[PDB]
């Protein structure tokens, strides 16, 4: 008697389960991945940080690159928090770039729509570009946050 289970099969695939942002490599080196964070954890977390992703050539890093000598193990890191926004934290040996503009390392920056981060600057032939995608679904939850219905 699985009445509720039967309906669950109706959807099958649920997009935007708890996705924060998605990283898409436009330079063709790293496979598209999706960064995610749980809402309960966000509302529960209060240590000036909920969930942060680390990117680089390190297998530990939340993001694995194609192994670039210029890029560092953990070239860059992305943090999620605030009232309802995302932040980008650069953590490379040579620096992290935003649309051609180099930002201050280990510095928090406001997220941008379809933004892109460039890394491995120094040699025109040794730079890597990454694009960041934002899940509108996630914003909806944060925008509504507390739902007025149940007492």
């Amino acid at each position: 008697a699985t009445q509720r289970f039967l309906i669950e099969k109706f959807s099958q695939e649920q997009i935007g389960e708890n996705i924060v942002c998605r990283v898409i490599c436009t330079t063709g080196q790293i496979p598209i991945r999706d960064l995610s964070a749980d809402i309960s954890q966000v509302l529960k977390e209060k240590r000036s940080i909920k969930k942060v992703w680390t990117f680089g050539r390190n297998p530990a890093c939340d993001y694995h690159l194609g192994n670039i000598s210029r890029l560092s193990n953990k070239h860059f890191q992305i943090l999620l928090g605030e009232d309802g926004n995302l932040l980008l934290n650069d953590i490379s040996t040579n620096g992290t770039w935003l649309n051609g503009q180099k930002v201050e390392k280990n510095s928090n920056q406001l997220l941008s729509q379809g933004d892109e981060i460039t890394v491995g600057v120094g040699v025109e032939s040794d730079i890597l570009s990454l694009v960041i995608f934002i899940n509108d679904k996630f914003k909806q939850c944060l925008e509504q946050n507390k739902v007025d219905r149940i007492r």
Partner: peptide, 13 residues
């Protein structure tokens, strides 16, 4: 630290 991964640094400060 300096050993692995190429790095840069300007000599003007």
């Amino acid at each position: 630290s300096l050993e692995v991964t190429e790095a840069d640094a300007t000599f003007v400060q």
